[PDB]
Symmetry: C3
Amino acid sequence: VDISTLPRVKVDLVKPPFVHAHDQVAKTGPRVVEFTMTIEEKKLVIDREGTEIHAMTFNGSVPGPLMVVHENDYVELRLINPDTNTLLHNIDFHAATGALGGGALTQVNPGEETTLRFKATKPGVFVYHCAPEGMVPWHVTSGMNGAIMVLPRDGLKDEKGQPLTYDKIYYVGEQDFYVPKDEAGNYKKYETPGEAYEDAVKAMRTLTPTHIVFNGAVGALTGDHALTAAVGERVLVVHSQANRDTRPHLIGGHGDYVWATGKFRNPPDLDQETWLIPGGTAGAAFYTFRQPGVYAYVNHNLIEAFELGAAGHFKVTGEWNDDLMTSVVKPASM
Amino acid sequence: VDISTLPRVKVDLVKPPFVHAHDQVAKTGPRVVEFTMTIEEKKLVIDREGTEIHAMTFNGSVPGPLMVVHENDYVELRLINPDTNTLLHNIDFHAATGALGGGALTQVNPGEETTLRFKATKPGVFVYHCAPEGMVPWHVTSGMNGAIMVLPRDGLKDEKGQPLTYDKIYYVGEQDFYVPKDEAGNYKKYETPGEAYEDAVKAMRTLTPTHIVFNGAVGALTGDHALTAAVGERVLVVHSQANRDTRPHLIGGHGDYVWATGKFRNPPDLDQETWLIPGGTAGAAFYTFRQPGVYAYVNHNLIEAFELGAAGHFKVTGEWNDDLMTSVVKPASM
Amino acid sequence: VDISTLPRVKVDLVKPPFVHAHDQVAKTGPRVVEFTMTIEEKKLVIDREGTEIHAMTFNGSVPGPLMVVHENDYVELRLINPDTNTLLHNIDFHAATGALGGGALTQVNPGEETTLRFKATKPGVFVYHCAPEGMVPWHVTSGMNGAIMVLPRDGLKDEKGQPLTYDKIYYVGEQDFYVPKDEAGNYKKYETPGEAYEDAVKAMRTLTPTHIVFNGAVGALTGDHALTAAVGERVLVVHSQANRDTRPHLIGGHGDYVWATGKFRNPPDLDQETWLIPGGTAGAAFYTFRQPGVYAYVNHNLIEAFELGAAGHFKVTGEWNDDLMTSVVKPASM
Ligand SMILES: [Cu+2]
Ligand SMILES: [Cu+2]
Ligand SMILES: [Cu+2]
Ligand SMILES: [Cu+2]
Ligand SMILES: [Cu+2]
Ligand SMILES: [Cu+2]
């Protein structure tokens, strides 16, 4: 078809765990959605003791933003690489087709620009990440990854063909950092990434992470940044992982509907206490809360969650329901 | 509803891999089942060379007991913490709802008691484990975990809606121990857990286990403790893992029906040679034997199974069936 | 039944990633297919810097050959152990039944022979591997593993009951090597396996691989050995893993139909960007290409793929389709 006869929309993205405005049901025919992402290389502090790394990011955040479109639409991305950066970057969509998902067409040196249009033909959640030849793990484990959701034209549908509507939608990306440390057990610091490259390769070859974080920082979704909800509300959590397997868990709740691979053509699973999301993919979980309070959202490899920092929080407002769970006898001292 | 108008039952649990008496089909309406578990901190020897650790357990066993109830019943647990113990414990069900699955209501110091009632609303196998704030991985990888099964009111059903009945039911919990060892490669010994806490944290941060055991000891399900069966019998094996992914395998047999996540609302899978059970969940496998002999039950990460101790045995009585598998020519020396 | 009244066929296998001739639809009734595999212990060079190991193989290749049969057929294997070898070997099928999948009947010392007949009763892809008592991980991680496919009698069927036909079929086995290295970081070399056994056990207990390779060598499916195809062709990739979990990914394409556990009785999944294959099992992926060019086939634990060698290539002939993905603006220097 002649795409020049299709409408065009302009969308400017938000910083996670929030998503830009959208509509769960298509109001029009296929359009051409337009995004604009900027690359940024900056130092980050990821834990409490001020460990710093040289992160590379889309729009200056770990992870990148979530782009929501509809099926059979046209995505047109405008990737910009400013001059103060120093490396060659290129994007790669798991939703595109051919040319390494768009990686062979998007190579940009410092101080350059590129546009790319592709068609979103399959519904579901997908992952995008940088991919320069010879430095793929380094770029992707420094923080250059994100997700993209391609809704069906009629919104979600459970396994019985009945519709599904979510009041809120949150996005969580789990990032594993392999920071190199010396013989003294202290993390080493550098000037610019090129110096840290080789000991980064060594640390990665050790094959175990040093940090695992939600939203690029230990505690970034804890305290005053907790994710909020109300009893009876319907929430969709998208969870992405670009390099390592992860197993999300909502301490207190469950998974009402779960796409553990994130592809909406398949029927979902029901009543999941803990599902598995392979490395390099995204998944979706639909849950509607029943009791108020504070929920935890962890990676149920409990060592990673409570020693490397893969834990966030949920604050849900409401009042108790003492039929589901009550304390018959308060903790008593005999 | 007014629960005071519901029957009450008293159940006393057994030591695994055996389950207390129950009925796969509900004979009455919803009841209130009553369990009573006691906490015990004791030294354990987990391998052949007498490596000892400071295990913490429910009812003095690793893992804890399996509690079988029916859907939409009321579970009332009475947790007791004696005075000779020295830590603060609290239980946490993945089947409950709200208050961290019951963890915020069950904190008991040494020499205390607590009751808690909740409603079992979802059918399937779930995991329960200790969870004190700040020592969750330590408590859960010292041995404070177990499972709980919530049958449907009509018993199991395959993917074609036909019933399913098991003659035997066994329960297996896989436990990974990170015992700290010194520079000499020898495992270190202590007085009480508080001393071992910090090197335990270090060993856990190494992120690889030192032992992996079925029923809390290397060889605990081998030799005279092998699990017994007969040709044509129907067995349901429940398998639980609270912290690490595992992949069960029955060398010689298969999986006739498999709930790899352990939720009975979903249809099962068929003819599984090896399924995956994520960390922090339980799964169920229904198998009916055909040939007699000795079967192995391993974790098919063969290194873990045959070097760290994740292997058990099955003794099935009967006589051969030389149509399925025969030796046309005996091993001959040319 | 009396098998002596059934036809007999003779099949001689090929070296992977190619499969011997077969027919996706059964032309006759059940037969007795006859294979003959020879054991070979030889030195291998697995990477670019000439690291050598003492591999043990079926027919002198890593992995072994793929055997394609039909359901309810009779497989008759003739395993031969020559005299220049020095160890005791025995085969073990995950598709057989009883006697450890055939491991208790097939023990052969150097200079011996054995035949074994079993019935292929379940359709799907299965794994076979050596299994001598006490050296199972060593034998299986030195390279003694392969796969076997048991097609249904009517060929494959998608989830809507419609047939499925593949023009090409490729087979890929992922092998993880734990080569022992000294204090200097250099890989140690030996004379014969018996010497290397103990440091091999130590290296395996470290629990992280040193190499991960497709077809037993770094780059073995890259360059002039790339897997070939044409736009619009239909390919079935079988992927096997005997010891460790793996997550295949086709950079640029997708998975049109995926049996992630490899059992054809279950319905497949659709539009998989990355599926998970547990350790000790095989899986199947049906894909039909749309755009030409060079595709990568990686294990999407990107560190393993691009640092340990788990990557292969696809060359597909044809011409572009600028409706699916086009470059609106060539990379421009502002
Ligand atoms: Cu980059
Ligand atoms: Cu990728
Ligand atoms: Cu405890
Ligand atoms: Cu838990
Ligand atoms: Cu062998
Ligand atoms: Cu096996």
